Amino acid sequence: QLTPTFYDNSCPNVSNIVRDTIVNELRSDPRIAASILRLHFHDCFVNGCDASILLDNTTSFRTEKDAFGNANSARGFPVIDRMKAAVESACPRTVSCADLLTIAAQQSVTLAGGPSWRVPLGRRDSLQAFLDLANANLPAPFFTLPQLKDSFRNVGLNRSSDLVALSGGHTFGKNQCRFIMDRLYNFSNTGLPDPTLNTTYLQTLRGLCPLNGNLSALVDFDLRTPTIFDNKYYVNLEEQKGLIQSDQELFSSPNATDTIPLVRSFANSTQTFFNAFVEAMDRMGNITPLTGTQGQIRLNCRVVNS
Amino acid sequence: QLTPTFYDNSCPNVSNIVRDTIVNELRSDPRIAASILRLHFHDCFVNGCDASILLDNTTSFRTEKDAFGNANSARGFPVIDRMKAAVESACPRTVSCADLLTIAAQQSVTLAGGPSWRVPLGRRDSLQAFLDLANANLPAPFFTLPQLKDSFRNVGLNRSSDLVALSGGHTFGKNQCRFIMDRLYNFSNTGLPDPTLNTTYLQTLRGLCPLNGNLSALVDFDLRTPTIFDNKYYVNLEEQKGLIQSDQELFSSPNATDTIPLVRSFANSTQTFFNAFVEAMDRMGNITPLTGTQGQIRLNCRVVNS
Amino acid sequence: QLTPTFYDNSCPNVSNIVRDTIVNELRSDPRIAASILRLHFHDCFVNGCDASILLDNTTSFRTEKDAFGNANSARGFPVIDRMKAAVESACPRTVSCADLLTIAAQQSVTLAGGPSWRVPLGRRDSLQAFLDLANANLPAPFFTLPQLKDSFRNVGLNRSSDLVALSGGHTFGKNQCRFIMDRLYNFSNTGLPDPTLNTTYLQTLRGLCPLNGNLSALVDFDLRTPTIFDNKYYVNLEEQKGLIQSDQELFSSPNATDTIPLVRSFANSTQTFFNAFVEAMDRMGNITPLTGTQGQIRLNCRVVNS
Amino acid sequence: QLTPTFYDNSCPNVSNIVRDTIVNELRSDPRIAASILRLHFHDCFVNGCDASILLDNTTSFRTEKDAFGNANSARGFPVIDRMKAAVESACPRTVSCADLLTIAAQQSVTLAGGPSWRVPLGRRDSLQAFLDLANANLPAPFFTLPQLKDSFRNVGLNRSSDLVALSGGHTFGKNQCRFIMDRLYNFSNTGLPDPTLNTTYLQTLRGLCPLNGNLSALVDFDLRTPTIFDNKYYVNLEEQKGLIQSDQELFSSPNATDTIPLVRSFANSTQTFFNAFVEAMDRMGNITPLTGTQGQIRLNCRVVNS
Amino acid sequence: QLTPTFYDNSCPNVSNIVRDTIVNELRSDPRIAASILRLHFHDCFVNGCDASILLDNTTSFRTEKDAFGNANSARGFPVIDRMKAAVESACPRTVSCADLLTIAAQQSVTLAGGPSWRVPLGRRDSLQAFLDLANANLPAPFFTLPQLKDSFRNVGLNRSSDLVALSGGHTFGKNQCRFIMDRLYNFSNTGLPDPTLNTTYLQTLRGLCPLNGNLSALVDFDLRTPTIFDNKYYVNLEEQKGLIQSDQELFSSPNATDTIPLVRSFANSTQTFFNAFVEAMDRMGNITPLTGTQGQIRLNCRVVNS
Amino acid sequence: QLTPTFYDNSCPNVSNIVRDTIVNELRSDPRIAASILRLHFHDCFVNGCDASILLDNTTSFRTEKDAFGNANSARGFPVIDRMKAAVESACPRTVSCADLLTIAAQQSVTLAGGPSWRVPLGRRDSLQAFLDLANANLPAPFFTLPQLKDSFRNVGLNRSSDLVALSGGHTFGKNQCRFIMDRLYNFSNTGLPDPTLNTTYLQTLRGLCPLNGNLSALVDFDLRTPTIFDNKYYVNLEEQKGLIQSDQELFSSPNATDTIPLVRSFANSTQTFFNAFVEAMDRMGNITPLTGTQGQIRLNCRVVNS
Ligand code: HEM
Ligand code: HEM
Ligand code: HEM
Ligand code: HEM
Ligand SMILES: [Ca+2]
Ligand SMILES: [Ca+2]
Ligand SMILES: [Ca+2]
Ligand SMILES: [Ca+2]
Ligand SMILES: [Ca+2]
Ligand SMILES: [Ca+2]
Ligand SMILES: [Ca+2]
Ligand SMILES: [Ca+2]
Ligand SMILES: [Ca+2]
Ligand SMILES: [Ca+2]
Ligand SMILES: [Ca+2]
Ligand SMILES: [Ca+2]
């Protein structure tokens, strides 16, 4: 039902427009590509990729921007508005916000040096935002592996490769100190740091996130190549250098039987990882989409067309 | 206009409640899933899926339960009342009986081992029952293929796949002897059995439905897997083992030019059949629904809210 | 994702059927093998090998047959229809037109004496034709080397070997006089012939394409073996006997630094060329294919299944 | 590094001298202003504005005058020699040929009625001519929009305004029939004229360039004001009256998403166009200049000082 | 594309492991080396050396073990499983079953005293088994020479040396009486034994395979050195002592014009035969392999990885 | 005497070749761009940019690779050999190793995100390596500011901007712990750390370079953007975060009167820094070059042509 050539006759330049917008932002916000990939992920895990995450509050529904995994964390919204205005100008009423965000996530990966592919298209925009569902569906950094696995399965991403490949999104981007404190100082009430955190790195992290510092300070997800989309994320995991608990568990959990091989496999071959990432991405992009005449094609991503 | 996420913020647990109710019934009535799928079908073919079939007699209108294809045949009503009370208790005045029956039919298929999907929702309940329309719209086992085709077209299901896929509902469930007698003994006044009925099976059927037995005795629609929702129904058709005339005609009628390929196709691939079934089901679920402020959300499925 | 054994259980005889059809045509049209190889190439460069080039005009989309590089040039369509009818007869609804054209191109090469291999299979057919994209993506005979290189890169064929190997398709086949006139008489407004065209050959070409003759008259791409698929194409390039500008530039352009070695290499070893050709062909055959449930398996290559 | 006041103390009268020379030529060759603007453009696109285009053949290097876009097309050289002798007489050894040609191009625009500004100065003259680079860098009338865009980007003119503004140089000047024939009779082998050429104008052009006439006959670039530097060039584009393919594509190409607005914008306001032109011109004038002690200040523009 | 050093950095000990396993088996089953060489041959002739022959039945495909030339004949499977477990233990997920069987066949030859060489590596495992293709591609003992030649050509082994060299695999190993009965008693309905079978040997064979004995009793292929890989196989052919019809025909067929010289040549020089064998083996090992990312690296040779 | 257009007619593709080589290396060694910039610097400071640093030992002279500032520090040599072979293949005997290394250093800067410019060319290669001169001319991390200033002046880089701009090369790249130990623990026998090293950073550095760790472990020169060529290097200096003593002294030395303003100036404007860097680079590239017929054009950078 979704096809990569959906706009080829109706709006042949969409990807160019999306790409130009991102390249442009990158000059002022080098973090933009990572943020955008994350928005798509947060979009798709709550009722599919329907742009529900882009809606602002209304008297009929609460915005997903207030969900626990989005509040004071999700960012990049004005950039999406900018690309939407640009494409409305070129192909009035034709490209939905759901598709736009998908194309943008894909372009962000390629621009950060990752694989290049054409994402299936033709999704439509939701009529409401689902805050409660977002609170229930988004995974948290403190989940154990069986919990992460449960979280992915819940939305239909039932293969270990889905979880392992998609976690590679942590090959760039930033993370707040608040999310790693319980690991640097008192992990799970043991009164000691997380035993799976390499001790040399532990010292560095403590320097970046001092026990009485700013919890909103940012640290890079990938210590090797912080801004390049490549497979270094997996190399770090093998050395016990995954930044957040959910990262390290893919390699260090007693339940990581089925994941350790994929991790090793992705760490050994950039190509194997890229192919896997691309397939996992297209599976995530296919979660319960709105197609045909369901939903709408928003004029502005933040509000339902009236 | 109908969207699968309609209740996601208002009554997130509906499907769970519906599913639990059915699983529970299944312990005492293994036939319940089949019966429920049949109610939805009989609902949708008479003025759309508006729960009109669930209304009991009033002084202003006759119940569809007395229609020729419903009388002493349709069953499962108390189970619908039970799930309705359960959901009224969880989400007072929010889920209509039309939606409830749709969710229930879908859950019955999955629970019997069929595909799993999210049905479009947001239908509303009718204000009256349409007995005459039911007498005119419901197909009968003795219809020829052009008649079955006419019957489906009449309600908008105009593709051969609609008829072939939806007939796969006969992959489980029961059927009364009365409906196959004219085939086992004197078919169409020829004084002989239906030539399209495999002769070995003919003997078995005669053992189950003796010339002077109980016409209400039940036989399984699918001799291979009587209770499992799978594609065996089509395999039987190729061997001349379709139970009722309307089943066998999809493969044996001289007019079965456009249907034979679909039958063969569904018999060869469980996946092809499942996809087809799901699409056909969603097309049937979209017949002239009552949406927006039309119709109502009944407190009890058997009566109009006063 | 694409595998050479895709039809081995479902339609084991496809290649035989394709081969027999071509052998048969060859008796009446000795040019058929060359034409078919060219169709596949023109198919793959416009949204991948999805048989989009085979669709005829509809009210929703214009046919690619009217694209600048196809109009009054592309040929062989009725032969594809013939092989499609033959395979539909043997394996109803199983082999897509995209796969058929790929198998046909490969068989045409082998039958003209080239290498023999099994092409990866499992592609599906597009839902529309892309005329504008064809106008933008197909290379022209007057492109400079950096332009040819840009054209190939654009579709993902980013290696110099891709361009050099695939240009070897000019080892057989015909070309119209109109495409070489600017070279025989007034090259690039210099008022003189192309200095890279051997002068003895120049005289012959002028005899074949007189200044006031028929622009549609045909000349052979390869003067050594016009109909045999071998490496002579490269030997001609070293002697300044490439027929069209884009051919000669691979060896004579000031930017031909990376291509001259491959040309020399392919001219010295039939085996080296064959291996290269085969790999380049499989890379071209892998451009953004439609797989799984995307696109369809057409009953007739010229129209979308309704 | 380049400053508009470079000669203000050393040779305060240069512009006057340049202007007087042009005014004088204009009496005998009304086309001179257009030709001169074109020389500067052809100078700057090949290794920057270094007067490399003005050098005649030597035994060490071939003249750029033989490049494909210059041969039997570029003109105005003796007029440059005349202004050079005049300024050598006033300020011996002080003004380079690169600066002279820049001042001349600017004066030609103003004298034809365009904006007036002071161009940045201080460039120096090259030691050789670059024929191959000229063959690779100069755009041709048959390029598609993505090709024109690629051509400009290649030399550093990376904004759509650069291409759109600078194409306005076609607001005056002449063009040979040979460059529009493929459009009037057989466009891209379609056997039909270019569909983007207004049909009334098509007839006029055919009258000026008969199918068997003189290919060197000249037609005006701008049908509204052939000799006045103004924004009419853009008005013609909106009516499908751009003379050469590269002109019309800025408005009619499927890829003209980012250019159509600029075209419309320049067509609506002479001032907006003038400002844009001036900025684009100064960006082109800044391509990799030779400054300080690099290159030399030629005594005669056609030869390197020995 | 296939290289002998493929595992040298990833799993340097594979050959040692394979060799040790075979040496070990040899103590209990002296026939193991011959059987293994035969498995590789049967693997390669059905869709290339992709380990398709090692897969057991599934509901999606029938095992090739039931093919006419495999049923109650092919053996050695548990030994392959043993070496696979041993190498999985040393280099988890790195060596495919296709490569393993190739290395094993080569080691079996050397261990039986044949030449020693490094086989090209890097093949991958198939996703299905091809029973019908096996029934069509495997040669039978009763084929005439033109039929054997046709059989080899069909898979790409088009030289007479391929057939003659590879038939030398009969220099060791066993054969069932059933395959030589038609020759010892009633050859081709002549009511007489095969005239090309030396009469003294005929008597011995009759003693081993009595007219009413066990058809599964085994006789040695090579009467001179039954277990040593050497050229004696050819010496026997010259004396009319080839055991099965396809063996003797290489020397006695009226069509054996091109083969008789090779036979004589191999009978005269152990070195000439060894070189030929090795080259023929590497050509057979190169039949349509799955490389790069095609196919997979099985964890267990009998089943597809799920 | 040196001109940026030196190879434009003789080997127009050199820069492309150099750039492609580096882009390629970057995939495996992200540190390559930094290393290459450093080689050029070490080349130019010892008898000018004459590629003397690239020569290996001979019986007539010792290699500069053994100089104190090169031994177990300088790297990237095989990459230079690779680009040299590539350009010899395209323009035999035309580009010297001295020019190649200059182009490479410039390309490394741009590829890491720095300015883009065309370096003056035409240098030639030396006939010997100068080890003693290298020992005397290369600056060390422990030099005081007057010593650094003396070192630069000695080779002709007599402006404070030369030292300040060129020190910005430390905006990327790595440095060994051994070079910062005296600063982290016992600075200049004071028994205390360097007072000009920010104390928070001091802790981090100590974590990276423990008092009894590996002296060859690497730390990044720029803590803000370790791999991006930008002006952050200067921002760190103002916060006392220059990594090595010679870095911090430009801002903290009592003699830093003339340098502090430049540091502040470069920290405030990326453009000001880029312009300065480029000019400083071209001044360094002009140190006593071998031109005309002096020196030679090496076939291989490691040895003198014999
Ligand atoms: C194409 C025309 C159709 C005809 C003529 C027909 C006829 C029948 C008949 C006569 C029975 C048995 C009634 C009894 O013994 O009391 C029956 C049962 C059933 N039918 Fe159909 N049917 C048709 C289409 C469908 C469709 C489209 C569906 C649903 C998707 C369906 C689902 C069922 C099920 C599941 C049962 C068994 C119900 C139970 O056991 O309670 N039928 N049908
Ligand atoms: C590299 C750029 C290429 C250009 C500019 C180009 C151009 C052309 C032209 C102009 C013709 C003759 C058209 C006519 O007279 O009607 C032609 C014919 C042909 N081309 Fe190419 N071609 C290119 C690449 C390829 C590729 C990659 C293949 C296939 C692997 C190919 C295969 C053929 C064949 C076999 C013919 C003859 C077709 C026939 O006789 O019907 N070409 N090509
Ligand atoms: C965008 C791509 C461009 C193309 C493909 C192009 C093409 C041409 C052609 C083919 C001619 C006529 C040649 C002849 O008949 O001999 C011409 C003339 C001219 N072009 Fe362009 N041009 C381009 C850009 C420019 C630019 C940027 C300028 C200057 C700012 C310019 C200024 C002129 C002028 C003034 C003439 C007339 C010269 C005369 O009458 O002597 N062109 N151009
Ligand atoms: C002002 C005096 C300078 C001193 C004392 C100095 C010192 C050093 C030292 C000690 C290292 C690390 C060596 C190692 O760990 O093996 C280094 C690396 C580096 N230096 Fe400098 N340097 C100076 C000037 C420059 C200049 C002018 C440039 C170039 C424009 C430069 C570019 C680099 C680069 C890019 C690296 C990292 C190389 C790599 O990662 O391989 N340095 N420098
Ligand atoms: Ca969503
Ligand atoms: Ca990374
Ligand atoms: Ca109803
Ligand atoms: Ca069943
Ligand atoms: Ca296509
Ligand atoms: Ca040929
Ligand atoms: Ca120039
Ligand atoms: Ca004008
Ligand atoms: Ca096989
Ligand atoms: Ca033997
Ligand atoms: Ca030096
Ligand atoms: Ca930096």
Check which CATH number belongs to the domain holding B242 and give it. 1.10.420.10
CB E83 within 8 Å of CB E104: yes
Nearest chain F residue to D61 by CA: give it: F9
Ligand 4, residue F175: give the atom nearest the CA.
15
Token pair in block for residue D186: 């057989």
Active site residues of F: 42
Ligand 4: residues with CB < 6 A are: F 31, 34-35, 37-38, 41, 73, 75, 139-141, 148, 166-167, 169-170, 173-176, 179, 244, 246
Residue keyed to tokens 């977002």: A134
The minimum CA-CA distance between A23 and chain C, rounded to whole Å, is: 19
Residue C200 neighbours by CB distance under 10 Å: 11
CB B32 within 8 Å of CB B26: yes
3-state secondary structure of E220: strand
Q: Is the dihedral of CA A246, A252, A256, A258 positive or negative?
A: positive
Which of C124, C130, C286, C291 best probes binding to A when mutated, by most A CB atoms within 10 angstroms?
C130
Which chain A residues touch E92 with a CB distance below 8 Å?
261
Task: Tell me how far apart the alpha carbons of residues F270 and F279 are, in angstroms, rounded to a whole number.
Answer: 14
Residue F186: what residue type? N
Residue C133 neighbours by CB distance under 10 Å: 20
Instruction: Give the 3-state DSSP-derived string for B246-293, with helices as H, strands as E and coil as C.
Output: HHHHHHHCCCCCCCHHHHHHHHHCHHHHHHHHHHHHHHHCCCCCCCCC
- Same-domain check for residues A259 and A271: yes
Nearest chain C residue to A8 by CA: give it: C130
Which of A184, A204, A268 best probes binding to F when mutated, by most F CB atoms within 10 angstroms?
A204
Residue C65: what residue type? K
Q: Is the dihedral of CA B40, B43, B49, B55 positive or negative?
A: negative
Is D230 known to sit in a ligand binding site? yes
- Same-domain check for residues D42 and D106: yes
Q: Which residues have CB under 8 Å from F238's CB, separation 6+? A: F251, F263, F264, F267
Task: Tell me how far apart the alpha carbons of residues A181 and A187 are, in angstroms, rounded to a whole number.
Answer: 8
Cβ of D34 less than 6 Å from ligand 3 = yes
* Cα dist from F24 to A92, A231, C193, D204, F14, whole Å: 41, 17, 40, 55, 15
Nearest neighbour of C9 by CB, restricted to E128, E288, E290: E128
Nearest in space to B245 (alpha carbons), one of B121, B111, B141, B163:
B141
Side-chain half-sphere CA neighbours of C165 within 13 A: 24
Nearest neighbour of A132 by CB, restricted to B12, B118, B120: B12
Size of interface C-D (CB pairs under 8 A): 42
- Same-domain check for residues F126 and F144: no
Residue D61: what residue type? F
Q: Which residues have CB under 8 Å from C295's CB, separation 6+? A: A3, C50, C96, C98, C124, C125, C126, C127
CB B225 within 8 Å of CB B171: yes
**A205-212 long-range CB contacts below 8 Å, 24 or more apart?**
A205/A180, A205/A243, A207/F200, A207/F203, A207/F204, A207/F207, A208/A177, A209/A177, A209/A180, A209/A181, A209/A184, A211/A185
Question: F208 and A204 in contact by Cβ < 8 A?
Answer: yes
Ligand 2, residue C141: give the atom nearest the CA.
5
* Cα dist from A174 to A69, C247, F200, whole Å: 15, 50, 21
CB F44 within 8 Å of CB F284: yes
Task: Tell me how far apart the alpha carbons of residues D87 and D92 are, in angstroms, rounded to a whole number.
Answer: 7
What residues does F175 pair with on adjacent strands?
F219
If you take atom 3 of ligand 2, which residue's CA is the nearest one? C139
CA of A41 to the centre of ligand 12 (A): 53
* Phi, psi values for residue A125, rounded to 5°: -90, 140
* Phi, psi values for residue B196, rounded to 5°: -90, 5
Burial of A159-193, coded b for 16+ CB within 10 Å and e otherwise, reads bbbbbbbbbbbbbbbebbbebbbbbbeebeeeeeb
Token pair in block for residue A6: 């959906």
Residue E189 neighbours by CB distance under 10 Å: 7
Task: Tell me how far apart the alpha carbons of residues B226 and B174 are, in angstroms, rounded to a whole number.
Answer: 8
B182: burial class by Cβ within 10 Å (0-12, 13-18, 19+)?
middle
Residue A52: what residue type? S
CA of D103 to the centre of ligand 12 (A): 21
Q: Which residues have CB under 8 Å from D37's CB, separation 6+? A: D105, D108, D109, D169, D173
Nearest in space to B54 (alpha carbons), one of B46, B62, B64, B44:
B64
Residues making up chain C, counted from first to last? 306
Residue D62 neighbours by CB distance under 10 Å: 18
- Same-domain check for residues C300 and C184: no
Instruction: Give the 3-state DSSP-derived string for F187-233, with helices as H, strands as E and coil as C.
Output: HHHCCCCCCCCCHHHHHHHHHHCCCCCCCCCEEECCCCCCCCCCCHH
CB E296 within 8 Å of CB E125: yes
Nearest chain B residue to C306 by CA: give it: B159
The minimum CA-CA distance between D171 and chain A, rounded to whole Å, is: 27
Which chain D residues touch C147 with a CB distance below 8 Å?
147
Q: Which residues have CB under 8 Å from B121's CB, separation 6+? A: B2, B3, B4, B5, B6, B7, B99, B102, B103
Residue E3 neighbours by CB distance under 10 Å: 11
Cβ of D229 less than 6 Å from ligand 3 = no
Which chain C residues touch A117 with a CB distance below 8 Å?
288
The helix or strand, by DSSP H or E, that contains position B174, with its residue range, turns out to be strand B174-176
CB B43 within 8 Å of CB B98: yes
Ligand 2, residue C174: give the atom nearest the CA.
40
The maximal CA–CA distance of chain A, rounded, in angstroms, is: 61
- Same-domain check for residues F157 and F258: yes
Task: Tell me how far apart the alpha carbons of residues C186 and C197 are, in angstroms, rounded to a whole number.
Answer: 12
Method for this entry: X-ray
Task: Tell me how far apart the alpha carbons of residues B62 and F162 are, in angstroms, rounded to a whole number.
Answer: 100
Cβ of D149 less than 6 Å from ligand 3 = no
* Cα dist from C205 to C171, C229, C245, E127, whole Å: 17, 22, 14, 53
Task: Tell me how far apart the alpha carbons of residues A294 and F281 are, in angstroms, rounded to a whole number.
Answer: 61
- Same-domain check for residues D31 and D154: no
Burial of B194-211, coded b for 16+ CB within 10 Å and e otherwise, reads bebbeeebbeebbeebee
**Angle of helix A160-167 versus helix A145-154 axis, rounded to 10:** 100
Q: What is the DSSP letter of E65?
A: G
Question: A89 and D261 in contact by Cβ < 8 A?
Answer: yes
* First and final C-alpha spacing in chain F: 27
Q: What's A69's domain CATH number? A: 1.10.520.10
Query: For chain F, how many structural domains are there in total?
Result: 2
Question: C92 and B275 in contact by Cβ < 8 A?
Answer: no
Which chain A residues touch B9 with a CB distance below 8 Å?
61, 128, 130-133
Task: Tell me how far apart the alpha carbons of residues F173 and E299 are, in angstroms, rounded to a whole number.
Answer: 43
Cβ of C167 less than 6 Å from ligand 2 = yes
CB A123 within 8 Å of CB A291: yes
Q: Is the dihedral of CA F279, F282, F286, F287 positive or negative?
A: positive
- Same-domain check for residues F82 and F110: yes
Q: What is the DSSP letter of D56?
A: P
Which chain C residues touch B265 with a CB distance below 8 Å?
93
Ligand 1, residue B72: give the atom nearest the CA.
16
Task: Tell me how far apart the alpha carbons of residues D235 and A158 are, in angstroms, rounded to a whole number.
Answer: 59
Token pair in block for residue C120: 């990866």
Is E171 known to sit in a ligand binding site? yes
- Same-domain check for residues E190 and E57: no
Which chain D residues touch F8 with a CB distance below 8 Å?
47, 128, 130, 133
**Residues of D at the F interface, defined by Cβ within 8 angstroms:** 47, 61, 126-128, 130-133, 288, 290, 294-295
Nearest chain D residue to C134 by CA: give it: D254
Question: Do β-strands D174-176 and C218-220 pair in parallel, antiparallel, or remain unpaired?
Answer: unpaired
**Residues of A at the D interface, defined by Cβ within 8 angstroms:** 12-13, 16-17, 89-90
Nearest in space to D263 (alpha carbons), one of C289, B151, D253:
D253
The minimum CA-CA distance between E44 and chain A, rounded to whole Å, is: 27
Cβ of C179 less than 6 Å from ligand 2 = yes
CB A83 within 8 Å of CB A21: yes
Find the domain containing D9 and state its range.
2-138+285-305
Q: What is the DSSP letter of B142?
A: T
Closest ligand to residue D43's CA:
11
- Same-domain check for residues B292 and B215: no
Question: C126 and A4 in contact by Cβ < 8 A?
Answer: no
Is E139 known to sit in a ligand binding site? yes
Question: Helical H runs in E66-186?
Answer: 77-90, 97-111, 131-137, 145-154, 160-167, 181-184
**Angle of helix A260-268 versus helix A270-284 axis, rounded to 10:** 120
Which chain C residues touch D74 with a CB distance below 8 Å?
none
Residue D147: what residue type? Q
**Angle of helix E160-167 versus helix E245-252 axis, rounded to 10:** 130
CA of C87 to the centre of ligand 9 (A): 21
Nearest in space to E137 (alpha carbons), one of E57, E245, E42, E66:
E42
Nearest in space to B243 (alpha carbons), one of B203, B284, B212, B201:
B201
- Same-domain check for residues D179 and D155: yes
Task: Tell me how far apart the alpha carbons of residues E252 and E255 are, in angstroms, rounded to a whole number.
Answer: 8
Task: Tell me how far apart the alpha carbons of residues B169 and A192 are, in angstroms, rounded to a whole number.
Answer: 60
Active site residues of E: 42
If you take atom 28 of ligand 1, which residue's CA is the nearest one? B169
Q: What is the resolution of this structure in A?
A: 2.2
Active site residues of A: 42
Token pair in block for residue F63: 């290699």
Task: Tell me how far apart the alpha carbons of residues E298 and E99 are, in angstroms, rounded to a whole number.
Answer: 11
Side-chain half-sphere CA neighbours of E122 within 13 A: 14
Q: What is the DSSP letter of B45?
A: T
* Phi, psi values for residue D2, rounded to 5°: -90, 140
Touch between chain D and chain E: 3 or more Cβ pairs under 8 Å = no
CA of F263 to the centre of ligand 16 (A): 15
- Same-domain check for residues E83 and E124: yes
**Angle of helix D14-26 versus helix D97-111 axis, rounded to 10:** 50
Task: Tell me how far apart the alpha carbons of residues F136 and A263 are, in angstroms, rounded to a whole number.
Answer: 50
Which of F21, F83, F89, F95 best probes binding to C when mutated, by most C CB atoms within 10 angstroms?
F89
Token pair in block for residue C288: 């953004």
Burial of B34-53, coded b for 16+ CB within 10 Å and e otherwise, reads bbbbbbbbbbbbbbbbbbbb
CB F184 within 8 Å of CB F205: yes
Token pair in block for residue A155: 């939305």
Ligand 4, residue F163: give the atom nearest the CA.
1
Token pair in block for residue A184: 């640097």
The minimum CA-CA distance between A89 and chain D, rounded to whole Å, is: 9
Token pair in block for residue D282: 């100064």
- Same-domain check for residues D26 and D70: yes
Q: What is the DSSP letter of D231?
A: T
Ligand 1, residue B218: give the atom nearest the CA.
15
CB C178 within 8 Å of CB C215: yes
Token pair in block for residue D243: 């003379």
Q: Is the dihedral of CA A166, A172, A175, A177 positive or negative?
A: positive
Residue F292 neighbours by CB distance under 10 Å: 9
